[PDB]
Ligand binder design. Structure first.
Ligand SMILES: *C/C=C(C)/C=C/C=C(C)/C=C/C1=C(C)CCCC1(C)C
Ligand SMILES: *C/C=C(C)/C=C/C=C(C)/C=C/C1=C(C)CCCC1(C)C
Ligand SMILES: *C/C=C(C)/C=C/C=C(C)/C=C/C1=C(C)CCCC1(C)C
Ligand SMILES: CCCCCCCCCCCCCC
Ligand SMILES: CCCCCCCCCCCCCC
Ligand SMILES: CCCCCCCCCCCCCC
Ligand SMILES: CCCCCCCCCCCCCC
Ligand SMILES: CCCCCCCCCC
Ligand SMILES: CCCCCCCCCC
Ligand SMILES: CCCCCCCC
Ligand SMILES: CCCCCCCC
Ligand SMILES: CCCCCCCC
Ligand SMILES: CCCCCCCC
Ligand SMILES: CCCCCC
Ligand SMILES: CCCCCC
Ligand SMILES: CCCCCC
Lengths: 240, 227, 242
């Protein structure tokens, strides 16, 4: 009731703070290399801040079949989570075609998760399993193609990737658990407590995640986005 | 959905599920190799088609809109799979990337305008069918001109692979307006159950059958197609 | 209204005429380079023509909370307006990553404007201010990185960009003013005159804007789309932070 709107505000204020920070740093290096990382970090927080305002105002919260569905989360995630995987893919030096495949799996994961959030007690679990299935394929890529590519970059880029990869995996693994423990699955935790965990995860997965990216230095991010080094990484990754 | 409709929604589902395992196995086996995009594109095409077919089995994307029951999950399926099919065919033909995007934009326009007719009145569903068919002819033109005029300029065994897939695509895609205009969206001359039979047979042919011929071309061939 | 239906037809006819013109010039520039410009201009007018037809038939005009919302405009704008900024981005020689940022902010502008169009009198203004904020940042980029990159390019191309930029700026400024003075905000102007303004703005911003693009020489258009002349304006722009 009141706990839901309070923690919806905590998420919205957390997103806005990241917007000011990422937006300032992104426009401070508009002519530089590595600009795409604070730029992507800014749009991820911007899209999340808007959608969090849609839920605060109740614009994207709707009862479908007896359950109050916060469907604005899926409008958020279907855009922000592919951008996060793309941002991590550029740092890892992964081939863009494999990045597009991982982003495609992410869209499938979010869309099927939305179907489960709108489904009945029998079928909300079925779509949860299918979405989790694509989630494991994403986790497999983050530990295989992502890690094998980044290992072939300089030590500081591979160091930044592994930190961001571990941050991503630890945070994202909690999302389906919050989903299944909330109103979409087993109504064992309250909606307010579910709103609490989602906002804490969202701020960590977007603002805290983006902070680690921009805190790597202008030289690091410029090297991670450099075309010569990326094509060098993709080539070396393919010869094994 | 009725008994025949539900039966043929399952045939399309199983067809896409089978294609997923084949294309998915081949895709992750060519991960560090060239030509990987073709088994991967074929996998995502069958994967997105499989999920949408499941939504229609469960009636999640089956709804009455203006009296009629509209299977709007098909247009969620088509607006994604058909642009990917033309893009995969555009890379095999060695087409310029800017005109691949243009052909894909014309394809999205075709699916969207076709969806408007699916939910419209018998006066205006035929009007949008003609608009949708108009862009379909422009795509058939590009398939017979720019697609063929760029595959000629490439390796002789790639050009043969293109002409096979393209002629498969053209003959298959031509029946879709026929079923639509003869189905519930146009003149209801065939039943919804019989209409779903045609869509299931066509979808499995144009996705798993089409995708099979692509991956059945050899690894050194698909590597040359992606360079 | 009778006036809205009339001016919905004017916009629809204006978009169709633009389709015939740009489609003819596109199919006459097949294996030439610079083909993307009349083809981009053609798709912009085609998407707008189809969406204007959906509004004529009332398919995309619906009472949402009881206010008549022409939500087909936002289905149109969320597609055509990012293409216009992208097409202008290629002419200006702007780096593609910054083009994507402007395009993303443009989609943000249309989406938040659609939310305001369907919301109550308290919060329709709040989303109007949010959308106008991203509009100001886009105008900032048009005067900043767009102009700084086209300045270092050919004299014929920089002249074309500035003409298109001034045309875009002047036309796009009127949209939030029509919006806030129309049914979406304070209902100061009627639905009929609001339909007039949107039709007049849309035709000029798509048919007239694209006309200036295609009415440039095939020399200028081929040079504006060149891969390595776009790599050189990017290399010079990215290294001249002086
Ligand atoms: C910033 C928001 C983020 C990073 C959201 C991430 C969300 C997920 C990783 C959601 C995953 C889901 C599953 C794995 C299956 C069931 C439903 C979802 C959507 C909770
Ligand atoms: C795998 C699914 C495929 C390949 C579907 C293809 C569908 C079409 C080519 C549909 C075309 C239509 C028209 C040309 C006009 C009227 C309506 C449609 C959607 C049947
Ligand atoms: C061809 C159609 C065009 C160029 C439409 C342009 C529309 C805009 C620049 C709209 C801007 C808006 C704001 C700046 C804030 C409030 C709402 C909008 C959508 C009117
Ligand atoms: C490139 C590797 C990640 C993309 C592949 C997408 C696979 C999605 C897995 C679907 C699993 C379905 C569970 C039944
Ligand atoms: C009435 C619902 C029952 C559906 C049964 C479907 C059986 C599928 C037959 C085998 C399909 C094989 C496709 C290649
Ligand atoms: C496929 C290459 C681009 C061709 C342009 C596609 C647009 C066709 C629209 C036709 C509409 C016809 C209405 C009667
Ligand atoms: C490279 C293009 C710049 C993109 C920045 C987008 C800015 C959005 C501003 C939103 C402000 C919200 C109003 C308070
Ligand atoms: C019975 C629940 C209805 C499910 C709607 C599914 C929407 C899928 C959007 C692609
Ligand atoms: C009253 C209008 C009938 C509904 C038509 C819906 C068309 C949607 C086009 C996207
Ligand atoms: C630069 C701060 C942007 C804040 C966005 C507010 C929610 C759309
Ligand atoms: C080895 C680094 C792990 C980082 C995970 C932190 C998530 C809060
Ligand atoms: C009704 C109180 C729910 C408490 C849930 C706590 C989950 C960590
Ligand atoms: C760069 C040429 C692309 C024109 C078509 C735009 C995609 C809808
Ligand atoms: C590869 C498994 C397909 C599942 C369809 C929902
Ligand atoms: C190049 C990344 C910017 C994308 C914004 C949607
Ligand atoms: C009801 C307004 C929400 C729109 C989300 C795109």
């Amino acid at each position: 009731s009141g706990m839901t709107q309070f923690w919806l505000w905590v998420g919205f204020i957390g997103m806005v703070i990241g917007c000011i920070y990422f937006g300032m740093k992104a426009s401070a290096m508009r002519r530089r290399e590595g600009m795409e990382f604070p730029l992507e970090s800014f749009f991820i927080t911007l899209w999340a801040a808007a959608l969090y305002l849609t839920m605060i105002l109740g614009e994207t919260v709707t009862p479908i079949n007896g359950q109050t569905v916060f469907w604005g989360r899926y409008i958020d995630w279907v855009v922000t989570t592919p951008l996060l995987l793309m941002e991590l893919g550029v740092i890892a030096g992964l081939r863009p075609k494999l990045i597009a495949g991982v982003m495609g799996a992410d869209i499938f994961m979010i869309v099927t998760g939305f179907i489960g959030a709108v489904e009945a007690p029998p079928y909300n679990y079925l779509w949860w399993l299918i979405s989790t299935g694509s989630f494991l394929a994403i986790l497999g890529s983050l530990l295989t193609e992502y890690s094998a590519s980044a290992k072939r970059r300089n030590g500081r880029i591979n160091s930044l990737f592994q930190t961001l990869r571990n941050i991503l995996i630890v945070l994202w693994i909690c999302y389906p658990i919050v989903w299944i423990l909330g109103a979409e699955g087993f109504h064992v935790i309250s909606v307010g407590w579910e709103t609490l965990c989602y906002s804490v995860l969202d701020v960590c997965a977007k603002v805290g995640f983006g902070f680690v990216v921009v805190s790597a230095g202008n030289e690091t991010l410029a090297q991670a986005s450099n075309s010569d080094r990326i094509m060098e990484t993709v080539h070396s990754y393919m010869q094994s």
